[PDB]
Every structure is written in structure tokens, then in C-alpha cells.
Amino acid sequence: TLNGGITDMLTELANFEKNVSQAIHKYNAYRKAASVIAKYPHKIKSGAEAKKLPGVGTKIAEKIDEFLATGKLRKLEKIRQDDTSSSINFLTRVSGIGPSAARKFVDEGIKTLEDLRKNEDKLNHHQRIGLKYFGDFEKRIPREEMLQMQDIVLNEVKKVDSEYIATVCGSFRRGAESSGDMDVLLTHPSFTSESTKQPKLLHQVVEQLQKVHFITDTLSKGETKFMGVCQLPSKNDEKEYPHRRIDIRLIPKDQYYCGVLYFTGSDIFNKNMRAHALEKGFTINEYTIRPLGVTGVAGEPLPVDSEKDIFDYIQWKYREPKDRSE
DNA sequence: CCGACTGCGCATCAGC
DNA sequence: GCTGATGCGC
DNA sequence: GTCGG
Ligand SMILES: Nc1ncnc2c1ncn2[C@H]1C[C@H](O)[C@@H](COP(=O)(O)[C@H](F)P(=O)(O)OP(=O)(O)O)O1
Ligand SMILES: [Cl-]
Ligand SMILES: [Cl-]
Ligand SMILES: [Cl-]
Ligand SMILES: [Cl-]
Ligand SMILES: [Mg+2]
Ligand SMILES: [Mg+2]
Ligand code: NA
Ligand code: NA
Numbered sequence: 001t002l003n004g005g006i007t008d009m010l011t012e013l014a015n016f017e018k019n020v021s022q023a024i025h026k027y028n029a030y031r032k033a034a035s036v037i038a039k040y041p042h043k044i045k046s047g048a049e050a051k052k053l054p055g056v057g058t059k060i061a062e063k064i065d066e067f068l069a070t071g072k073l074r075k076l077e078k079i080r081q082d083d084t085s086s087s088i089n090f091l092t093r094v095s096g097i098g099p100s101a102a103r104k105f106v107d108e109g110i111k112t113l114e115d116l117r118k119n120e121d122k123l124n125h126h127q128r129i130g131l132k133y134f135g136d137f138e139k140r141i142p143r144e145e146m147l148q149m150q151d152i153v154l155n156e157v158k159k160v161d162s163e164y165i166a167t168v169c170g171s172f173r174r175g176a177e178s179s180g181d182m183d184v185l186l187t188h189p190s191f192t193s194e195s196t197k198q199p200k201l202l203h204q205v206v207e208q209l210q211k212v213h214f215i216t217d218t219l220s221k222g223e224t225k226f227m228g229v230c231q232l233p234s235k236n237d238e239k240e241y242p243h244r245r246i247d248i249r250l251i252p253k254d255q256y257y258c259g260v261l262y263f264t265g266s267d268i269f270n271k272n273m274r275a276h277a278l279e280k281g282f283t284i285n286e287y288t289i290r291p292l293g294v295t296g297v298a299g300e301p302l303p304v305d306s307e308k309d310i311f312d313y314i315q316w317k318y319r320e321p322k323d324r325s326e
Numbered sequence: 327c328c329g330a331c332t333g334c335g336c337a338t339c340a341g342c
Numbered sequence: 343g344c345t346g347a348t349g350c351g352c
Numbered sequence: 353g354t355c356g357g
Binding site: 286 | 337
């Protein structure tokens with residue numbers, strides 16, 4: 001939290017750009033600058049000092065100079081007092097309502113939690129569930145509950161088939177003391193890049209988790225990705241736990257290392273690492289790392305036997321999950 | 327200056 | 343129905 | 353909004 005003030009500011013700016021301006025590159029630029037400043041081991045004394053860091057330019061340096069001198073950013077003060085921006089920023093806090101739907105709702109005069117609630121018939125399924133659990137989804141999950149959650153998921157997956165392997169990734173795998181949700185990487189020997197020797201692999205797991213009342217709602221579901229809602233069981237007389245977001249990703253077993261690298265994150269670490277790969281003439285996704293041809297076309301997938309192999313290709317010293325929280 | 331900016335699954339919609 | 347674009351979120 | 357060439 002050395003520079004909590006500055007990173008907060010930049011994060012607020014990134015949000016404004018994504019949510020209100022619908023300017024995706026500015027959003028990514030701001031997140032990048034916030035992230036680099038967050039890891040900088042010194043209390044930033046000036047914009048010029050910040051500007052030394054990759055991803056901080058003249059505009060951000062200037063904002064940092066304003067923020068340091070006054071403690072705030074006029075630009076942000078104004079954004080905050082603007083009803084349309086405020087409203088749009090609020091509606092996007094509901095899962096399933098993004099920048100476009102937010103602006104549409106505000107046009108229609110839907111702009112409060114109350115409005116949303118009385119106009120449920122105007123929401124798609126995802127949005128309806130997001131409204132349902134609006135409060136819960138903004139709560140953090142203590143690692144201690146994540147551990148309980150992990151135990152359930154792992155045991156129920158075992159019950160469906162001992163050959164499944166379920167791994168909890170995301171912030172949990174990076175060692176975080178609290179998580180925004182639970183991310184589960186799933187593999188089965190029957191699903192490889194070579195074939196799918198068994199159908200409903202993901203469905204069967206989802207069903208079992210529903211059967212035991214752990215998964216409570218579904219945001220979306222396909223053959224390889226599930227997005228939904230879950231809840232720990234409480235005890236006699238005890239208040240219930242908040243409902244939690246859960247994501248499950250089924251990945252070809254032979255592509256586990258690329259998959260776990262992807263699902264471990266952080267999102268910015270991934271973006272950073274993937275960008276570096278391109279600079280070294282590779283492209284990395286959750287399945288494969290491939291070379292780029294002179295033309296620019298991705299070539300064939302390279303041999304991968306560990307996460308470190310991936311780092312090796314792009315000439316990065318290996319970084320443990322706990323050190324990928326950018 | 328200016329092109330490029332990480333990479334992709336699922337839901338929904340237009341156009342055919 | 344399909345495909346391809348766009349929204350949303352990982 | 354930033355950067356590399
Ligand atoms: N934009 C992205 N680009 C690349 N990989 C991504 C991206 N977004 C997510 N992933 C990968 C890398 C992410 O780590 C992983 C899970 O995405 P979560 O949305 O659950 C989120 F970021 P987590 O890190 O888990 O933190 P918490 O959930 O707040 O506690 O998917
Ligand atoms: Cl932009
Ligand atoms: Cl401010
Ligand atoms: Cl792999
Ligand atoms: Cl691939
Ligand atoms: Mg997560
Ligand atoms: Mg997630
Ligand atoms: Na810089
Ligand atoms: Na949202």
C-alpha cells in the first residue's frame with residue numbers, strides 16, 4: 001500500500017474509461033500503470049519519478065503530480081459528481097451488466113438497485129442472478145472458506161470419477177488470504193487435444209455439485225466452461241454463508257501446464273507475459289505456446305512439460321504463483 | 327508519427 | 343438453422 | 353494512454 005493513493009486513482013480512471021467512455025485501450029493502459037506502480041518498492045515522491053516506470057506516460061505523470069500536491073484529481077472529482085457517469089458506473093457492478101447495457105438502462109431511466117429490482121423482466125438470465133446476489137458478490141472470501149470450498153469440490157469430483165483432477169487456481173493458488181471467487185481447473189484422461197472419448201465431462205461434475213446443493217445457480221455453461229454460483233453448507237442455527245461466484249474450466253489433460261498457467265493469473269500477469277512472448281516471437285494461450293512465423297501466423301504447439309518450460313521459451317526466469325500477483 | 331495493444335468461452339443478435 | 347459480430351466475463 | 357521502431 002506504499003502508493004495506495006495513486007494506484008486507487010488510476011484504477012478509478014481505468015474503470016471510468018472502460019465503463020463510461022467505452023475506451024478499452026485506455027482502460028488497459030491505466031490498469032497497466034496502476035500495476036507497475038503497485039509493485040514499485042518506494043513511496044513515489046513525484047510524477048517524474050513515476051514516469052521512469054514502463055507504462056506510465058506524460059499524462060499519468062501529470063495526474064500523479066496533481067494527486068501528490070492536492071490529494072485528489074479534479075478530473076475524478078467531476079466524474080464523481082456526474083450523474084450519468086455515476087449511474088453507469090453503478091449498474092456495471094451487477095454481474096452481466098457491462099458498459100453497453102449499463103448505458104442502455106440509464107437511457108431507459110433504470111439507474112438504481114430499486115429500478116433494477118422492479119424491472120427484473122428487462123434482464124437476461126445472467127443479469128437476473130447478478131442482481132439476486134448483488135451484495136454477496138461484492139463480499140471477499142476468506143481463505144479459510146476457500147479451503148472448505150476446495151475440500152467439497154475435490155471430494156465431489158472424486159465421487160463422480162477418481163480419474164478427474166480438479167485444481168483451484170486464480171488468486172487462491174497465488175496464496176491470497178482472500179479471493180473474489182473460486183476458480184477450478186478440471187481435467188479428465190478422456191478429454192485431450194487428441195480426442196473427446198467421453199461426453200458431458202463438465203456437465204457430470206456440475207450436476208453432482210448441484211445434487212449436493214453446493215452449486216446453486218448458473219450464469220452460463222458450455223462444454224468447457226461453467227460460470228455460476230455456489231454456497232458452503234452452514235450448521236444448525238448458524239447464519240448462512242454468502243453465495244459465491246464459481247468458475248470451472250475443463251482443459252485437455254495434455255495441455256494442463258498451459259491451462260494452469262492461464263487460470264493461475266493474475267489477469268495482468270497473463271497480459272504482461274503474453275505480450276512479452278509476442279516480443280520473443282511466440283504466442284501463448286491456455287492451451288499451447290506456439291512460435292510466430294516470419295509472416296505472423298502462429299506455428300505448431302511446442303512441447304510443454306511444466307509451467308517452467310513456458311517461462312523458459314520466452315526467456316523469463318521462473319516465477320512462483322505467489323509472485324504472479326500483478 | 328502511428329500502428330498496435332493477451333487471448334478466448336458462452337450468450338445473444340443480425341443477416342441470410 | 344448457420345455464421346460472424348458484439349457484449350460480457352475468465 | 354503508452355510505447356517501439
Ligand atoms: N483478462 C484476462 N486475460 C488473461 N487471463 C485472464 C484474464 N482474466 C482472468 N484471467 C485468468 C487469470 C486469472 O487469475 C484467472 C481467474 O480469473 P478471475 O476473474 O477469477 C480473477 F482475475 P483472480 O486472479 O482469480 O482474482 P479474484 O478472483 O479477484 O480473487 O483467469
Ligand atoms: Cl481506447
Ligand atoms: Cl481523487
Ligand atoms: Cl501444456
Ligand atoms: Cl491453441
Ligand atoms: Mg478468481
Ligand atoms: Mg473467476
Ligand atoms: Na514510462
Ligand atoms: Na458487471
